[PDB]
C-alpha cells in the first residue's frame, strides 16, 4: 500500500494565509515530481504548482505567482503548498499530487493524489 495522505483545508478570510499538505507512505516519493492541482466550481482540475524531485525547480501558474509556495521536506515524505493573501479566486478542491507522466508535450499526468480537500476564501 503506497498512499498520498492530505491534510488540510479550510475557511479563510481574503487577504489570509493557509497551508495545506501531503504525506506519502509505503516508499519514498524522493524520485517524484509533485504537484497542487485546485479545481474551483464548474471547472476542470488544473495544475497550480509544481516541484522537482529535491525542490531545485519549481513551477507556478500565473494567477498564484508570488503568493503560493510548493515547498517539500524529503525526510518527512511530504509536500505542502503555502498560500497568502488569499483571493475568492482561490476557492476551489485542492488535491496534492506525484509521480510526473506525459502522453502528450507538457501534459502531466500523475501516480498519485491526495484525496483532495475544500479551501474557500470569502470576500
Known amino acids: 500500500q503506497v498512499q498520498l495522505v492530505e491534510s488540510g483545508g479550510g475557511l479563510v478570510q481574503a487577504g489570509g494565509s493557509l497551508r495545506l499538505s501531503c504525506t506519502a507512505s509505503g516508499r519514498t516519493f524522493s524520485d517524484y515530481d509533485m504537484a497542487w492541482f485546485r479545481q474551483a466550481p464548474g471547472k476542470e482540475r488544473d495544475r497550480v504548482s509544481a516541484?522537482?524531485?529535491?525542490?531545485?525547480?519549481?513551477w507556478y501558474h500565473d494567477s498564484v505567482k508570488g503568493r503560493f509556495t510548493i515547498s517539500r521536506d524529503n525526510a518527512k515524505n511530504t509536500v505542502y503548498l503555502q498560500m497568502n493573501s488569499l483571493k475568492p479566486e482561490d476557492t476551489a478542491v485542492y488535491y496534492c499530487a506525484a509521480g510526473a507522466v506525459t502522453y502528450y508535450s507538457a501534459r502531466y499526468e500523475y501516480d498519485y493524489w491526495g484525496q483532495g480537500t475544500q479551501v474557500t476564501v470569502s470576500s
Open positions: 516541484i522537482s524531485t529535491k525542490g531545485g525547480s519549481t
